[PDB]
Amino acid sequence: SEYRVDLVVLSEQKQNCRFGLTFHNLSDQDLNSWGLTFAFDRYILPDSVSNGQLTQIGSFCTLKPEGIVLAANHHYYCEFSIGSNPFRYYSDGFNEAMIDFVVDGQPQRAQVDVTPIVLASPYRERSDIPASLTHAQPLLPKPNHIEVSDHSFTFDEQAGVAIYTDLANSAKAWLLEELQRIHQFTLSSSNSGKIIFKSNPTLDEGAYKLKVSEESIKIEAGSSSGFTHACATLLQLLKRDEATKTMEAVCCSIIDSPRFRYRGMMLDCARHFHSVEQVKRLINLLAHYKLNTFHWHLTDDEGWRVEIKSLPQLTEIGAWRGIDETIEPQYTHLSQRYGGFYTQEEIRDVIAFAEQRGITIIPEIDVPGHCRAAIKSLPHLLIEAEDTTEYRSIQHYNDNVINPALPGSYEFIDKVLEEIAALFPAPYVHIGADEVPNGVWSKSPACQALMEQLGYTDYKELQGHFLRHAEDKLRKLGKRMLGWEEAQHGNKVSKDTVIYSWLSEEAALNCARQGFDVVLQPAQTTYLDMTQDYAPEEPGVDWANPLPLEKAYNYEPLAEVPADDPIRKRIWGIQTALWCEIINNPSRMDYMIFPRLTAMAEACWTEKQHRDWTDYLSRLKGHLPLLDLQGVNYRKPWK
Numbered sequence: 001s002e003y004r005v006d007l008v009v010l011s012e013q014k015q016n017c018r019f020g021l022t023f024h025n026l027s028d029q030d031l032n033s034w035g036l037t038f039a040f041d042r043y044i045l046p047d048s049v050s051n052g053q054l055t056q057i058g059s060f061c062t063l064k065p066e067g068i069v070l071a072a073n074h075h076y077y078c079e080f081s082i083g084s085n086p087f088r089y090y091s092d093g094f095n096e097a098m099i100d101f102v103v104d105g106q107p108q109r110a111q112v113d114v115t116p117i118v119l120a121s122p123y124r125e126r127s128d129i130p131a132s133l134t135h136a137q138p139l140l141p142k143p144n145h146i147e148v149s150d151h152s153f154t155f156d157e158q159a160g161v162a163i164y165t166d167l168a169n170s171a172k173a174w175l176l177e178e179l180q181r182i183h184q185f186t187l188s189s190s191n192s193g194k195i196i197f198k199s200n201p202t203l204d205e206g207a208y209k210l211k212v213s214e215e216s217i218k219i220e221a222g223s224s225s226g227f228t229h230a231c232a233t234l235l236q237l238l239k240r241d242e243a244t245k246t247m248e249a250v251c252c253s254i255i256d257s258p259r260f261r262y263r264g265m266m267l268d269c270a271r272h273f274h275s276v277e278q279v280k281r282l283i284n285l286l287a288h289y290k291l292n293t294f295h296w297h298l299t300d301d302e303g304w305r306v307e308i309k310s311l312p313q314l315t316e317i318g319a320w321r322g323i324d325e326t327i328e329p330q331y332t333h334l335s336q337r338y339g340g341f342y343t344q345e346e347i348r349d350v351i352a353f354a355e356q357r358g359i360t361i362i363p364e365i366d367v368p369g370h371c372r373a374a375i376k377s378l379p380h381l382l383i384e385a386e387d388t389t390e391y392r393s394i395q396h397y398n399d400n401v402i403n404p405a406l407p408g409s410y411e412f413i414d415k416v417l418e419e420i421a422a423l424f425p426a427p428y429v430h431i432g433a434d435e436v437p438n439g440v441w442s443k444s445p446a447c448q449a450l451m452e453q454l455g456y457t458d459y460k461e462l463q464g465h466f467l468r469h470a471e472d473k474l475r476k477l478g479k480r481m482l483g484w485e486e487a488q489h490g491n492k493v494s495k496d497t498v499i500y501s502w503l504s505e506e507a508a509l510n511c512a513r514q515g516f517d518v519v520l521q522p523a524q525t526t527y528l529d530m531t532q533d534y535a536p537e538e539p540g541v542d543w544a545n546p547l548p549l550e551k552a553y554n555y556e557p558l559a560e561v562p563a564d565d566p567i568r569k570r571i572w573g574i575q576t577a578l579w580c581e582i583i584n585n586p587s588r589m590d591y592m593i594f595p596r597l598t599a600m601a602e603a604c605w606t607e608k609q610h611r612d613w614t615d616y617l618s619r620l621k622g623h624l625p626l627l628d629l630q631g632v633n634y635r636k637p638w639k
């Protein structure tokens, strides 16, 4: 196009980086009253800006040039710095850029072409996956016990499916749906069928037996979830022959049980909105690897994605961002109005859909921090005009924290939680409870007064006051509260609050020893937003470090702790998360989630003794064609 911006690393030192920004007017016309905006994920040092005035709100940066006019075929040059060790990835550059200018007194906008950043210090090393054989049974996760016989079972579309327990209804409907959707293979219910669902009360929750014989398949379970897990195994076990409307399973005996009770995946829908069809699609894929929990991250600074009828403004304002919108653009789509939200009717449809695959949905509503979208939506309710407190969040925001002294904050949170509790049948609600920015509420008159009333000597204690109100409210609504690990410090939440630990296993067990229930979600091994390889072209982020597939598989939760340890009562299970700062489409989403999710699924499900990297690679390789039939854009392990 007419306008191009080039970013170049000029200097690299310990915790410090300098950049050269060059903007080219390649149009024939001069630019008048011109200004540059771009998306950048790092905090730019404000006194470091050499040739213009920079304003930064989150990722959204506006640079006013010192020059009023930029001539045709001319260049504008600026330097800035950041406090950071070297950039390793092209995605560390500007995601998008654009300009504003005036022709004949009228405002104009143009998209700017952003050259890939010229990196000084890309990784030279590359993560190599060794060549692998293809395993005959590509089962992910690995069943804890499988015995394979020499024979095989071949069946046609008239084989029939028999069900002798109502517990298996959901699993049975799902199998048939998936065999139809994936393979176009139609099975029907037959009381005299070759595929049998049988009840076995001795089996624990989620456990199943699956035996393939020469002329029959028998599935046994004592729970709905068990039959669901069994059907996920059977989908991976079946091989469809072409030029014969037929399916083949190896004769085998499988006895299987889940290692952990909670096996979850969190999706960030606030940073970027993913449509109902996309969410459904992921949820069903989750069920394929025997995950039982979808954690829906619905609210954050960059968006509010859940319809609240009592507060229409949250989705009418807070679901949208753009230059013309109340909320500024972030990350991508700088030129347009970006957004979306889920209606309560759509959420009801997603809940029902998930339940058919044994998937519980946990909603997350972030307070008091990460609340920018809500605050812009309800200014009269949630803003104290007399607050002069200067603070910066970790995501470069100075105006994103709820005020625990305002009565409107309590009106807001009560109204939202009532509608969330009624909408979501799962007995859990996640409240955020992220650490507040340093010095927040420090110059708030309303907060100063509330400290004196409660006897608090430090402003951080207000956090606990707000969170305790949320917990008590959720308790009246019949919901247990869930929170991120910071909630455990102080007395901000009771022992009933479930803690999501991302720091370390040692911190998680510390928390468990205190009497909290906890979910392990370590940043270093379970964050699927992290890059998958060391090459600079790989999409993702790397602040927690690159996470290639081998590092993902080597994650082995609670390896050192014995099977009998009473602390394991406190460990709900494991979770993996996708943060969506730079994920705005299903192609990129697939690429990041797959194949690593299968490794996370195996960590969740399979006992450590049955885990092996080589064996895992061989099963992943035989599983790849099944993902291809579904059109999942997984990152290729062998390319």
Ligand SMILES: CC(=O)N[C@@H]1[C@@H](O)[C@H](O)[C@@H](CO)O[C@H]1O
Binding pocket: 434, 484, 502, 523, 527, 529, 541, 579, 580, 581
């Ligand atoms: C609970 C929390 O603070 N989570 C942050 C999330 O906001 C951010 O999107 C992600 C980037 O990878 O870093 C996680 O640690």
